[PDB]
Tab-separated table of C-alpha atoms and ligand atoms in Angstrom:
chain	number	residue	atom	x	y	z
A	18	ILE	CA	84.592	93.085	113.044
A	19	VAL	CA	83.012	92.910	116.637
A	20	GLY	CA	81.814	96.255	118.501
A	21	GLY	CA	82.065	98.313	115.372
A	22	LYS	CA	79.824	100.162	113.021
A	23	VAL	CA	78.948	100.281	109.406
A	24	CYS	CA	81.748	101.861	107.223
A	25	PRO	CA	79.468	104.538	105.179
A	26	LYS	CA	79.861	103.565	101.515
A	27	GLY	CA	82.795	104.780	99.885
A	28	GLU	CA	84.924	105.679	103.228
A	29	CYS	CA	86.731	102.280	102.985
A	30	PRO	CA	87.647	102.427	99.194
A	31	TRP	CA	90.474	100.236	99.424
A	32	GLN	CA	88.739	97.337	101.111
A	33	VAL	CA	88.840	94.450	99.209
A	34	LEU	CA	86.503	91.316	99.343
A	35	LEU	CA	88.078	87.649	98.265
A	36	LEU	CA	85.931	85.028	97.047
A	37	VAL	CA	86.218	81.290	96.237
A	38	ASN	CA	83.576	79.755	94.042
A	39	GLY	CA	81.596	83.095	94.887
A	40	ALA	CA	81.859	82.552	98.788
A	41	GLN	CA	83.387	84.610	101.161
A	42	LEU	CA	87.140	83.686	101.860
A	43	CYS	CA	89.167	86.872	103.006
A	44	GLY	CA	89.702	90.405	103.154
A	45	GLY	CA	92.210	92.313	101.432
A	46	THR	CA	94.033	95.867	100.812
A	47	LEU	CA	94.258	97.555	97.218
A	48	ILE	CA	97.710	99.462	96.923
A	49	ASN	CA	97.690	100.018	93.412
A	50	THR	CA	95.278	99.431	90.891
A	51	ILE	CA	96.626	96.069	89.934
A	52	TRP	CA	98.050	95.157	93.434
A	53	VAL	CA	96.341	93.733	96.690
A	54	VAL	CA	97.863	92.847	100.004
A	55	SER	CA	96.009	90.063	102.145
A	56	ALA	CA	96.971	87.195	104.841
A	57	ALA	CA	98.917	84.005	103.595
A	58	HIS	CA	96.583	81.848	105.563
A	59	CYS	CA	93.750	82.697	103.665
A	60	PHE	CA	95.178	80.438	100.828
A	61	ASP	CA	96.407	77.297	103.017
A	62	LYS	CA	93.336	75.457	101.289
A	63	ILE	CA	93.011	76.677	98.010
A	64	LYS	CA	92.466	73.562	95.634
A	65	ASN	CA	91.494	75.310	92.098
A	66	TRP	CA	93.730	78.828	92.202
A	67	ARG	CA	91.489	79.853	89.390
A	68	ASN	CA	88.334	79.970	90.940
A	69	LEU	CA	89.786	83.223	93.179
A	70	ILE	CA	88.243	86.584	92.689
A	71	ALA	CA	88.998	89.711	94.010
A	72	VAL	CA	85.965	92.396	94.493
A	73	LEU	CA	86.779	96.093	94.927
A	74	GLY	CA	83.851	98.884	95.635
A	75	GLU	CA	81.749	96.668	97.343
A	76	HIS	CA	79.734	97.612	100.413
A	77	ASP	CA	76.369	95.779	100.953
A	78	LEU	CA	76.596	92.030	99.891
A	79	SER	CA	72.775	91.798	99.756
A	80	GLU	CA	72.725	94.309	96.377
A	81	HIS	CA	74.240	95.022	93.221
A	82	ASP	CA	74.501	99.007	92.792
A	83	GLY	CA	77.199	99.143	90.002
A	84	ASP	CA	80.194	100.152	91.908
A	85	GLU	CA	81.883	97.147	92.273
A	86	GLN	CA	84.500	95.834	90.104
A	87	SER	CA	85.467	92.337	90.232
A	88	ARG	CA	88.746	90.638	88.767
A	89	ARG	CA	90.584	87.403	88.587
A	90	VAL	CA	93.625	86.699	90.729
A	91	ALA	CA	96.597	86.185	88.143
A	92	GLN	CA	99.220	85.710	90.925
A	93	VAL	CA	99.396	84.895	94.673
A	94	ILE	CA	102.876	85.501	96.392
A	95	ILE	CA	103.571	84.459	99.651
A	96	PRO	CA	106.908	84.512	101.473
A	97	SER	CA	109.385	81.689	101.496
A	98	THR	CA	109.454	82.028	105.417
A	99	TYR	CA	105.669	81.362	106.105
A	100	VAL	CA	104.122	77.809	107.323
A	101	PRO	CA	100.903	77.008	106.625
A	102	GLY	CA	98.242	77.171	109.353
A	103	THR	CA	100.771	79.505	111.411
A	104	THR	CA	100.477	83.220	112.345
A	105	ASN	CA	104.296	84.328	111.768
A	106	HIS	CA	104.815	86.011	108.138
A	107	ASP	CA	101.128	86.103	107.356
A	108	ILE	CA	101.039	87.871	104.364
A	109	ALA	CA	100.198	87.608	100.373
A	110	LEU	CA	100.698	89.679	97.381
A	111	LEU	CA	98.117	89.629	94.830
A	112	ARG	CA	98.321	90.141	91.299
A	113	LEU	CA	95.016	90.955	89.495
A	114	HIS	CA	94.409	89.933	85.837
A	115	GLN	CA	93.601	93.337	84.835
A	116	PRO	CA	93.640	96.701	86.792
A	117	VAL	CA	90.645	97.993	88.439
A	118	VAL	CA	89.178	101.404	87.555
A	119	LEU	CA	90.079	104.205	90.439
A	120	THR	CA	86.626	105.792	91.249
A	121	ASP	CA	84.965	107.511	94.241
A	122	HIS	CA	84.315	103.590	95.551
A	123	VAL	CA	87.766	102.396	94.133
A	124	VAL	CA	90.888	103.884	95.710
A	125	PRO	CA	94.301	102.647	96.909
A	126	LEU	CA	95.865	102.780	100.381
A	127	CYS	CA	99.234	104.174	100.286
A	128	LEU	CA	102.348	101.454	101.151
A	129	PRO	CA	104.420	103.646	103.167
A	130	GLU	CA	108.106	103.772	103.228
A	131	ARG	CA	109.782	101.506	105.777
A	132	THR	CA	111.261	104.324	107.555
A	133	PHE	CA	108.359	106.575	107.863
A	134	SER	CA	106.102	103.612	108.665
A	135	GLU	CA	108.755	102.663	111.705
A	136	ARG	CA	109.732	106.142	112.835
A	137	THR	CA	106.375	107.724	112.679
A	138	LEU	CA	103.304	105.420	111.785
A	139	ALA	CA	104.281	102.998	114.371
A	140	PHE	CA	103.514	105.780	117.114
A	141	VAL	CA	100.098	106.742	115.905
A	142	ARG	CA	97.749	105.235	118.893
A	143	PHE	CA	94.462	104.414	116.775
A	144	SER	CA	94.052	102.846	113.434
A	145	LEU	CA	91.057	101.411	111.496
A	146	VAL	CA	90.326	97.570	110.788
A	147	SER	CA	87.508	96.747	108.612
A	148	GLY	CA	85.689	93.641	106.957
A	149	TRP	CA	82.662	91.610	106.355
A	150	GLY	CA	83.825	89.084	108.985
A	151	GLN	CA	81.777	87.702	111.861
A	152	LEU	CA	80.098	90.473	114.381
A	153	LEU	CA	80.580	88.012	117.168
A	154	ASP	CA	82.394	85.293	118.240
A	155	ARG	CA	80.704	82.212	116.607
A	156	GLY	CA	78.287	84.668	114.881
A	157	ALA	CA	76.952	85.474	111.428
A	158	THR	CA	78.725	87.706	109.406
A	159	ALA	CA	78.144	91.301	108.188
A	160	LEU	CA	76.188	91.999	104.901
A	161	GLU	CA	77.513	95.520	105.288
A	162	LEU	CA	81.127	96.562	105.621
A	163	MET	CA	82.303	97.326	109.068
A	164	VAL	CA	85.150	99.209	110.658
A	165	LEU	CA	86.589	99.817	114.095
A	166	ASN	CA	88.945	102.122	115.411
A	167	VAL	CA	91.603	100.280	117.523
A	168	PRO	CA	94.834	101.016	119.670
A	169	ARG	CA	98.214	99.538	119.060
A	170	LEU	CA	100.282	98.384	121.775
A	171	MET	CA	103.991	97.843	122.075
A	172	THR	CA	105.102	94.159	121.770
A	173	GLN	CA	106.244	94.304	125.271
A	174	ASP	CA	102.562	96.080	126.813
A	175	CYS	CA	100.571	93.432	124.834
A	176	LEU	CA	102.308	90.462	126.833
A	177	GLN	CA	102.140	92.293	130.171
A	178	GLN	CA	98.486	93.066	129.555
A	179	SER	CA	97.911	89.969	128.031
A	180	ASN	CA	104.557	83.796	120.477
A	181	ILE	CA	104.363	87.645	119.091
A	182	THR	CA	107.372	88.422	116.873
A	183	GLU	CA	108.620	91.360	115.135
A	184	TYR	CA	106.725	90.691	112.403
A	185	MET	CA	103.662	90.962	114.204
A	186	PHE	CA	102.097	93.582	116.200
A	187	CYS	CA	98.918	93.488	118.623
A	188	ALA	CA	95.829	95.991	118.917
A	189	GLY	CA	92.327	96.387	119.911
A	190	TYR	CA	90.969	95.635	123.299
A	191	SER	CA	91.182	92.796	125.914
A	192	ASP	CA	87.896	92.683	127.695
A	193	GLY	CA	85.933	90.811	124.602
A	194	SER	CA	83.899	93.514	123.693
A	195	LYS	CA	85.593	95.118	120.370
A	196	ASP	CA	87.846	93.275	117.849
A	197	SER	CA	88.606	91.973	114.154
A	198	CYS	CA	86.855	88.603	113.594
A	199	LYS	CA	86.826	85.701	111.376
A	200	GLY	CA	86.042	86.523	108.185
A	201	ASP	CA	88.148	89.719	108.380
A	202	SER	CA	91.503	88.034	107.909
A	203	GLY	CA	93.546	89.825	104.791
A	204	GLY	CA	91.717	93.194	105.747
A	205	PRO	CA	93.471	96.613	106.471
A	206	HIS	CA	94.911	98.071	109.666
A	207	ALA	CA	95.077	101.533	107.942
A	208	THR	CA	96.650	104.744	109.771
A	209	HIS	CA	96.114	108.000	109.612
A	210	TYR	CA	98.817	110.945	109.442
A	211	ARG	CA	98.380	114.613	108.327
A	212	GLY	CA	95.542	113.772	106.123
A	213	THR	CA	96.604	110.670	104.252
A	214	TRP	CA	95.947	106.875	105.119
A	215	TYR	CA	98.663	104.432	105.118
A	216	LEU	CA	98.493	100.438	105.381
A	217	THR	CA	100.468	99.499	108.776
A	218	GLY	CA	98.915	95.984	109.515
A	219	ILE	CA	96.834	93.107	107.935
A	220	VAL	CA	94.520	91.459	110.138
A	221	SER	CA	96.171	87.965	110.798
A	222	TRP	CA	94.561	85.395	113.262
A	223	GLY	CA	95.417	84.619	116.837
A	224	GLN	CA	93.750	81.878	119.470
A	225	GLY	CA	90.265	83.525	119.055
A	226	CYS	CA	87.994	86.569	118.063
A	227	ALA	CA	86.943	88.864	120.942
A	228	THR	CA	88.543	86.617	123.685
A	229	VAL	CA	89.078	88.335	126.792
A	230	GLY	CA	92.443	88.636	127.981
A	231	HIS	CA	93.458	88.559	124.303
A	232	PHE	CA	94.310	91.303	121.392
A	233	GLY	CA	94.351	91.084	117.639
A	234	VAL	CA	97.475	90.033	116.008
A	235	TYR	CA	98.024	91.751	113.008
A	236	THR	CA	101.221	91.310	110.563
A	237	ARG	CA	103.557	94.229	110.889
A	238	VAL	CA	103.729	95.355	107.201
A	239	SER	CA	106.836	97.717	107.589
A	240	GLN	CA	108.722	94.520	107.732
A	241	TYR	CA	107.667	93.617	104.180
A	242	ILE	CA	107.928	97.297	102.234
A	243	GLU	CA	111.055	96.248	100.501
A	244	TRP	CA	109.593	92.707	99.396
A	245	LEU	CA	106.836	93.722	98.039
A	246	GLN	CA	108.221	96.745	96.164
A	247	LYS	CA	110.477	94.253	94.719
A	248	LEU	CA	107.689	91.940	93.524
A	249	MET	CA	105.695	94.503	92.169
A	250	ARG	CA	108.530	95.712	89.791
A	251	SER	CA	108.864	91.743	89.040
A	252	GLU	CA	107.297	90.031	85.647
A	253	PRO	CA	104.159	87.554	86.514
A	254	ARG	CA	105.147	84.087	86.554
A	255	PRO	CA	103.090	81.193	85.129
A	256	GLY	CA	101.364	79.399	87.689
A	257	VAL	CA	99.108	81.239	90.275
A	258	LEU	CA	100.906	80.626	93.597
A	259	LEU	CA	104.629	81.767	93.605
A	260	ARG	CA	106.513	81.462	96.976
A	261	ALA	CA	109.163	84.011	97.159
A	262	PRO	CA	112.208	84.309	99.127
A	263	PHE	CA	111.858	86.256	102.406
A	264	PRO	CA	113.971	88.639	103.253
B	9	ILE	CA	116.026	114.807	111.693
B	10	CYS	CA	113.620	112.610	110.525
B	11	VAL	CA	112.992	110.597	113.422
B	12	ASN	CA	112.070	113.667	115.358
B	13	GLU	CA	108.523	115.266	114.434
B	14	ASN	CA	108.734	113.060	110.951
B	15	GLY	CA	111.796	115.739	109.945
B	16	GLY	CA	108.768	118.259	109.533
B	17	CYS	CA	107.944	116.312	106.487
B	18	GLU	CA	104.060	115.535	105.495
B	19	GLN	CA	105.056	112.169	104.197
B	20	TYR	CA	108.402	110.754	103.642
B	21	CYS	CA	111.768	111.675	105.095
B	22	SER	CA	115.433	111.243	104.168
B	23	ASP	CA	118.682	112.625	106.059
B	24	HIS	CA	121.805	113.491	104.313
B	25	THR	CA	125.345	114.204	105.198
B	26	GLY	CA	125.321	117.259	107.603
B	27	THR	CA	122.257	119.296	108.715
B	28	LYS	CA	120.512	118.312	105.663
B	29	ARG	CA	116.815	116.757	105.089
B	30	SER	CA	115.038	115.906	102.084
B	31	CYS	CA	111.193	115.292	102.173
B	32	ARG	CA	109.608	113.405	99.555
B	33	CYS	CA	105.885	112.562	98.345
B	34	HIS	CA	104.117	109.152	97.353
B	35	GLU	CA	103.510	108.784	93.446
B	36	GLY	CA	100.316	110.792	92.464
B	37	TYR	CA	101.665	113.834	94.869
B	38	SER	CA	104.229	116.978	94.102
B	39	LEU	CA	106.266	118.273	97.069
B	40	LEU	CA	105.592	122.157	97.252
B	41	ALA	CA	107.936	125.201	97.564
B	42	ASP	CA	107.924	124.884	101.639
B	43	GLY	CA	109.885	121.712	101.146
B	44	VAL	CA	107.551	119.681	103.149
B	45	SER	CA	103.929	119.654	101.943
B	46	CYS	CA	102.772	117.279	99.701
B	47	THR	CA	99.559	117.846	97.135
B	48	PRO	CA	97.783	115.284	94.870
B	49	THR	CA	98.388	115.540	90.799
B	50	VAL	CA	95.952	112.933	90.153
B	51	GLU	CA	92.245	112.761	90.630
B	52	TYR	CA	92.473	109.624	92.622
B	53	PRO	CA	95.718	109.886	94.805
B	54	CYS	CA	96.498	106.982	97.437
B	55	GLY	CA	95.336	107.386	101.055
B	56	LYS	CA	92.400	110.028	100.360
B	57	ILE	CA	88.648	109.201	100.603
B	58	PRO	CA	87.000	111.128	97.711
B	59	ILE	CA	83.538	111.507	99.013
B	60	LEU	CA	85.049	113.034	102.159
B	61	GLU	CA	87.461	115.310	100.369
B	62	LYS	CA	84.817	116.536	97.810
B	63	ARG	CA	82.824	116.863	101.102
B	64	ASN	CA	85.131	119.837	102.136
B	65	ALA	CA	86.310	121.451	98.553
C	26	7Y7	O1	93.099	76.382	107.194
C	26	7Y7	C1	93.713	76.889	106.929
C	26	7Y7	N1	93.561	78.054	106.037
C	26	7Y7	C2	92.104	78.415	105.491
C	26	7Y7	C3	91.414	79.657	106.181
C	26	7Y7	C4	91.200	80.311	105.025
C	26	7Y7	C5	90.317	81.615	105.301
C	26	7Y7	C6	90.197	81.716	106.792
C	26	7Y7	C7	90.610	81.231	107.531
C	26	7Y7	N2	90.295	81.115	109.463
C	26	7Y7	N3	89.943	80.054	109.890
C	26	7Y7	C8	89.843	80.706	111.243
C	26	7Y7	C9	90.146	82.144	110.886
C	26	7Y7	C10	90.269	83.080	112.163
C	26	7Y7	O2	89.821	82.784	113.086
C	26	7Y7	N4	90.779	84.335	111.673
C	26	7Y7	C11	90.504	85.641	112.959
C	26	7Y7	C12	90.367	86.462	112.190
C	26	7Y7	C13	90.344	87.756	113.050
C	26	7Y7	C14	91.097	87.673	114.164
C	26	7Y7	N5	91.047	88.429	115.326
C	26	7Y7	C15	91.352	88.462	116.502
C	26	7Y7	N6	91.966	87.440	117.236
C	26	7Y7	C16	91.970	86.368	116.313
C	26	7Y7	O3	92.247	85.254	116.746
C	26	7Y7	C17	91.479	86.239	114.880
C	26	7Y7	C18	91.071	85.427	113.950
C	26	7Y7	C19	90.539	82.116	109.603
C	26	7Y7	O4	90.777	83.473	109.019
C	26	7Y7	C20	91.287	79.785	107.623
C	26	7Y7	N7	95.139	76.862	107.266
C	26	7Y7	C21	95.345	75.978	108.337
C	26	7Y7	C22	96.447	75.066	107.729
C	26	7Y7	C23	96.889	73.674	108.886
C	26	7Y7	C24	96.254	73.841	109.991
C	26	7Y7	C25	95.071	74.656	110.022
C	26	7Y7	C26	94.735	75.483	109.532
C	27	CA	CA1	76.958	95.720	96.666
C	28	CL	CL1	97.695	77.672	88.751
């Protein structure tokens, strides 16, 4: 996250850290005790799918304070329409091997109904994006969880103020001062409405972190609600990676 | 009705045949008698931040 602030411990309780062989891979969003939403492109180069770990309740990566909960990833589900190395349909649904325990520091973000998200949440201007990604373009990653308030653009206005499909949206700033960054992909774009927070986007990827004249590109979660809900009702299948038909 | 002002609902909204509307709440919440408000039914409902909820409790 570029140009944000530290998310005070416990104020981003749905944030997930994904690790491969102990190393930072990507962010994610808890939506229930066993389900995490992330970005498909995080898994393009995974060789050993059994070394993937999800961590909840994380804040400061330099220390262990006892609020962290680590789980193995039992399933990674990606839409059939996603092409590795690209931006369109950049979403993944992860099933944890065992549920996390909800606590003051571990709480799911609400996955909204599609109608609610399209009719109402889509017109809330500002939303929060978070992660342990790079603090600058070509810079070191953050040790404490960072958060940034970003304004959403209509796709017409993104193109004017700057391809971008109906499965994406633009949010953030074009002046290069504030943006999501490499290391934040898969993390939440969370939107507040009448006292409750909802998942509206996933940090995807564009042509560069904090690039002047360009906005952050986010997966438009509202297009995937029905797809996600059906998968969450389904039984697990052998083999971690699952490609599921979209729509 | 639901397209304007979220139909007055705090959370989810469904249109019905006629001048009819029904609000609904996410799992872990229940709908109040006003027909629009949602109140938690569990300790850790989705989309709420415990340390901030207890800070105003
Ligand atoms: O290698 C493949 N996958 C591995 C894999 C895993 C995890 C992270 C990554 N990975 N590498 C670069 C980035 C990245 O820059 N993210 C990023 C985050 C926030 C942003 N905010 C605003 N604007 C942005 O532009 C933006 C960009 C990223 O997330 C790759 N696939 C692939 C497949 C075929 C060809 C090339 C690549
Ligand atoms: Ca820690
Ligand atoms: Cl496997």
